[PDB]
């Protein structure tokens, strides 16, 4: 009995907002938006709201961007999608399904494409009007591991290591990967 009660408590506390974190930006429009979400969190247990509030506090690198096609790929049949970050255009795609994106920012070329295909962009202040009970929303996230600088982490002189050496490079010059597997 007790062991379950304990674990179910830990799982909850792992979701909820910390309330001793604050965004480092001196932008007063960004700090306004955080204040709203903070006052909502202390009056609710709903996991989507808590997740959103934690993400506004993370760094620029933690808020990695997504391309339009990848949002649709991760939307998994939902109508509204939410994203704490910036939405960029995909040059490989022209036609898209009708969709509503609530997000932090969008690029000029992406917004046009979204509009031509039918669909809307709303800023995160408006979420509560777009949705009544937060049942029809999906929440989506990028991954900072996909940066090109992650190819150099680790040691290239370990056995079976996939990492690349930091090297001078030319037509003949350059250190190779030699301890990997193929």
């Amino acid at each position: 009995m007790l062991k379950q009660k304990m674990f179910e408590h830990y799982k909850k506390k792992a979701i909820l907002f910390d309330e001793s974190r604050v965004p480092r930006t001196k932008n007063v429009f960004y700090q306004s938006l955080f204040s709203l979400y903070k006052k909502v969190c202390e009056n609710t247990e709903n996991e989507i709201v808590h997740k959103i509030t934690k993400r506004l506090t993370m760094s620029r690198t933690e808020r990695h961007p997504l391309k339009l096609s990848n949002i649709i790929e991760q939307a998994n049949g939902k109508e509204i999608v939410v994203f704490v970050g910036k939405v960029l255009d995909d040059d490989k795609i022209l036609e898209i399904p009708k969709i509503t994106i609530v997000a932090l920012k969008i690029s000029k070329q992406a917004k046009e494409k979204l509009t031509l295909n039918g669909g809307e962009f709303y800023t995160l202040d408006k979420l509560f009007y777009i949705s009544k009970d937060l049942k029809d929303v999906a929440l989506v996230k990028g991954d900072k591991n996909n940066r090109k600088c992650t190819r150099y982490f680790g040691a290239s002189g370990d056995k079976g290591s996939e990492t690349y050496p930091r090297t001078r490079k030319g037509a003949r010059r350059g250190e190779r990967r030699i301890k990997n597997k193929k």
């Binding site: 150099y152 040691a155 930091r166 090297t167 001078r168």
Partner: protein, 55 residues
């Protein structure tokens, strides 16, 4: 030398090496303007530059 870096290669060994600064950049620009202007008076109706082919 410690840790992981691209191996150095910085060429500052030679003690006889000269440095060139560019503090004169705005002033020399103003002189080139004033020379063109006076040259343009000496041949007033005519353009300062000649016609050239396309290659």
């Amino acid at each position: 030398m410690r840790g992981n870096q691209m191996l150095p290669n910085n060429h500052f060994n030679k003690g006889s090496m000269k440095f060139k600064n560019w503090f004169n950049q705005p002033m020399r620009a103003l002189k080139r303007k004033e020379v063109r202007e006076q040259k343009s008076k000496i041949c007033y109706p005519n353009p300062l530059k000649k016609l050239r082919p396309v290659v």
